[PDB]
Design a protein around this ligand. Structure first.
Ligand SMILES: Cc1cc2nc3c(=O)[nH]c(=O)nc-3n(C[C@H](O)[C@H](O)[C@H](O)COP(=O)(O)OP(=O)(O)OC[C@H]3O[C@@H](n4cnc5c(N)ncnc54)[C@H](O)[C@@H]3O)c2cc1C
Ligand SMILES: [Cl-]
Ligand SMILES: [Cl-]
Ligand code: NA
Ligand SMILES: [Zn+2]
Ligand SMILES: [Zn+2]
Ligand SMILES: [Zn+2]
Length: 746
């Protein structure tokens, strides 16, 4: 840079492009008669640092009277119709003319190799190729010096055009996009729950990935693709397509390489990258997950993610998820569970005749891309889709006219809309309870326009209100007007809502196969003061490890059953208290026959229009628990103020109320006695004491995030109440565990 005023002695570079490192640009395409081979040309053309072509081969295709113009102009037409990106002699050489490169099969060699001008590269070739194919010892011939060049840092920046894969496995799924925008060349069956790519311009599908844009986390891990995401996108999309093509078996770099097909040396960069990005996606849980296991000497991450030690508190969905993930990564993992069984708020009763009923979760709310859907695939497990019909039954007997509900649903929704319009102005400090805000708005839509409602119309309204109480997990006077539906504005899991007939506990028992799980051992103290962390069970037993993951229910953090040393942030404590620990309660009844068949008519559920507003949560809905319509088990939900009105009376007293209600719903017929039954008491299961979280009034959705933030890279949190995007659910919990495993493994 200094002493270069003199044109006379400035440096002479043979390639015009600034920063090329080839001092002797040879030509790769003896395509004209007067190819300048290694000799002189008026201009060199830069493709990569080890790939150039001379001015005569440029003209041989670009000029009208020359005899390449045919082949090139045929290409140029297809390109502009099938692609968004501009067609140039440069792009043409890259797409059409560059020789293909291939690695040797035998473990000794593994040398890269140029192929001949006519050999077209295919997966079978790459899968098997050894040195010399269409005697001697080819496997000693020196590797081309250009090959060592590509794994060098700066080499990709000197590539002039992004690589576009050919015949990508991801090409079916991506047909709605211009191939260039997706990293495939312009010149060219699975599971229905698995739609993994957004279609152009579509939004609001959970867990869908944009095929043509890098996510933010992807950009932070691979900053080298800020300039041009194309190579990354193509490789990432390919990896996805491969995994949803077969998810019962671990996707390795070896299965990916045969499908990376590009002209040029770029292919060497591509098979090098594919390994790094496949490992990034295995950490984040994008692939090689669910209930896949491995087991035993073979792991899912390079040995340098090993010799970290983790202790996980809680054997619930979130805990177990994190544990499968870590154990599959090759990390050393111990789970301590308080109770005498794994599963947590997942606990399936199998003692019923021919049916399994969940005391805990049993429903899947949106199957498209749901981890639970995936896991049902790997396990060969069928899940039943709910039907639309659900007529609401008055006591005693008459099925409410659909046009009544259809109009009471309008008004109920219109009330929420006025609430949500009133929010826009209010801060956290001005939050009021949702139920108070509803009641008020109602009373002055009545006192306003004198249009008053029938007694039934009023009861049907209460039925809708009852549903919110089930959704929120508490009486509406506790839930935030400002944030009750905070999570609905993020993308939601599309698709079927389904009953999980075998019950969540089969996917939880499988998650937990062959893991170090200590039961009957509740944690009492977590000391992260020293170098590693020191956890102590109530009885005295000490456990130590490098990092710790707590997956404990929100209610147990709120009433500090774990001593933190140092103690938790004040900002973290306000968040933990910002949320409400919701309850509902379940009752399941086994009858000698399906007494409801004549009235209900094979529907999946039926509704119970509540007599007084006071009792709106007392058996609001009954669920047919055999989709085969063969057995007779009904299950029902106790929500809102009804949950409190039942904490005092014993099981057989709540049974009797439910039977009173069923006898009133079927007034004009007989109903038999239950043979078998249960009533859940989650409220008072010492080690859970809740059902799911919600935003207490005064809170905000942001609290889930604060609870999720780790402490000093040593203490991590997962669980249903750490997941702001997907709260409450078994799938939301599972995800959070996978999320923290990703963090820990890093
Ligand atoms: C009646 C009911 C119905 C539900 N319905 C559905 C549904 O239909 N669909 C759905 O998706 N979800 C449903 N849910 C919610 C769902 O079950 C939870 O979101 C999910 O189970 C949360 O799992 P988790 O891993 O966050 O914690 P949990 O499943 O709550 O497990 C936490 C574990 O922590 C352990 N623990 C607590 N303290 C300690 C300690 N000090 N030391 C060691 N271990 C400790 C507990 O023993 C427990 O095993 C329902 C829940 C209930 C109770
Ligand atoms: Cl150039
Ligand atoms: Cl294959
Ligand atoms: Na520490
Ligand atoms: Zn150059
Ligand atoms: Zn040439
Ligand atoms: Zn070889």
């Amino acid at each position: 840079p200094l002493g270069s005023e003199f044109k006379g002695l400035r440096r002479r570079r043979k390639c015009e492009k600034a920063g090329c490192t080839a001092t002797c640009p040879v030509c790769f395409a003896s395509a004209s008669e007067r190819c300048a081979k290694n000799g002189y040309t008026s201009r060199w053309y830069h493709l990569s640092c080890g790939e150039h072509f001379c001015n005569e081969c440029f003209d041989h295709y670009y000029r009208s009277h020359k005899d390449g113009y045919d082949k090139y102009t045929t290409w140029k037409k297809i390109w502009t119709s099938n692609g968004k990106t501009e067609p140039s002699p440069k792009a043409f050489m890259a797409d059409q003319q560059l020789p293909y490169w291939v690695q040797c099969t035998k473990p000794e060699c593994r040398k890269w190799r140029q192929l001949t001008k006519e050999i077209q590269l295919t997966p079978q070739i790459a899968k098997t190729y050894r040195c010399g194919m269409k005697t001697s010892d080819h496997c000693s011939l020196p590797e081309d010096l250009r090959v060592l060049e590509v794994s060098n840092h700066w080499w990709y920046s000197m590539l002039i055009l992004p690589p576009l894969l050919k015949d990508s496995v991801a090409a079916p799924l991506l047909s709605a996009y211009y191939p260039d925008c997706v990293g495939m060349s312009p010149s060219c069956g699975m599971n229905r729950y698995f739609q993994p790519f957004y279609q152009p311009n579509e939004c609001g599908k959970a867990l869908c990935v944009r095929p043509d844009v890098m996510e933010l986390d992807e950009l932070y891990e691979f900053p080298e693709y800020s300039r041009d995401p194309t190579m990354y996108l193509a490789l990432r999309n390919l990896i996805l397509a491969l995994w949803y093509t077969n998810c019962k078996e671990a996707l390795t770099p070896q299965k990916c390489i045969p499908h990376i097909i590009v002209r040029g040396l770029v292919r060497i960069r591509c098979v090098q990258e594919v390994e790094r990005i496949l490992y990034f996606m295995t950490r984040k849980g994008l692939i090689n997950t669910g209930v896949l296991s491995v087991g035993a000497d073979q792991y899912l991450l390079p040995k340098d993610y090993h010799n970290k030690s983790v202790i996980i508190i809680g054997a619930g969905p979130a805990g177990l998820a994190a544990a499968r993930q870590l154990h599959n990564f090759g990390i050393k993992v111990t789970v301590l569970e308080a109770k005498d069984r794994i599963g947590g708020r997942v606990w399936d009763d199998k003692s019923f005749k021919g049916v399994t009923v969940g005391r805990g979760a049993q429903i899947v709310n949106g199957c498209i891309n749901n981890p639970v859907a995936l896991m049902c695939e790997q396990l060969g497990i069928s899940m039943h889709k709910f039907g639309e019909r659900c007529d609401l039954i008055q006591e005693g007997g008459r099925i409410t006219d659909p046009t009544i509900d259809k109009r009471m649903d309008f008004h109920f929704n219109a009330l929420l809309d006025v609430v949500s319009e009133w929010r826009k102005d209010k801060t956290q400090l001005q939050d009021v309870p949702l139920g108070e805000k509803i009641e008020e708005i109602y009373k002055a839509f009545i006192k306003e326009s004198g249009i008053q409602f029938s007694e039934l119309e009023g009861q049907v309204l209460q039925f809708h209100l009852s549903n919110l109480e089930y959704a929120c997990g508490s009486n509406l006077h506790q839930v935030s007007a400002r944030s009750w539906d905070h999570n609905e504005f993020f993308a939601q899991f599309a698709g079927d809502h389904t009953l999980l007939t075998p019950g969540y506990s089969v996917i939880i028992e499988k998650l937990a196969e062959g893991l170090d799980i200590q039961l009957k051992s509740p944690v009492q103290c977590i000391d992260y003061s020293g170098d590693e962390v020191q956890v102590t069970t109530t009885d005295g037993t000490g456990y130590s490890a490098q990092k710790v993951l707590v997956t404990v229910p929100l209610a147990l953090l709120q009433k500090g059953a774990i001593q933190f040393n140092p103690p938790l942030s004040e900002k973290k404590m306000k968040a933990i208290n910002s949320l409400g620990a919701g309850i509902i309660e379940k009752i399941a009844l086994q009858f000698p026959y399906r007494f409801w068949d004549s009235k209900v008519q094979g529907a999946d559920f039926f509704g119970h229009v509540p007599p007084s507003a006071s009792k709106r949560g007392l058996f609001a809905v009954f669920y047919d628990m055999d989709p085969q319509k063969k057995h007779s088990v009904l299950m029902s939900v106790i929500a809102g103020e009804a949950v409190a009105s039942v904490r005092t009376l014993d099981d057989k007293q709540v049974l009797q109320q439910c039977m009173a209600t069923l006898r009133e719903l079927f007034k004009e017929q007989e109903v038999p006695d239950p043979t078998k039954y249960f009533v859940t008491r989650w409220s008072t299961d010492p080690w859970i004491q809740m059902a799911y979280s919600f935003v207490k009034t005064g809170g905000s959705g942001e609290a889930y995030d604060i609870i999720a933030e780790d402490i000093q890279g040593t203490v991590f949190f997962a669980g249903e109440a750490t997941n702001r995007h997907f709260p409450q659910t078994v799938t939301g919990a599972y995800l959070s565990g996978v999320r923290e495993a990703s963090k820990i493994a890093a």
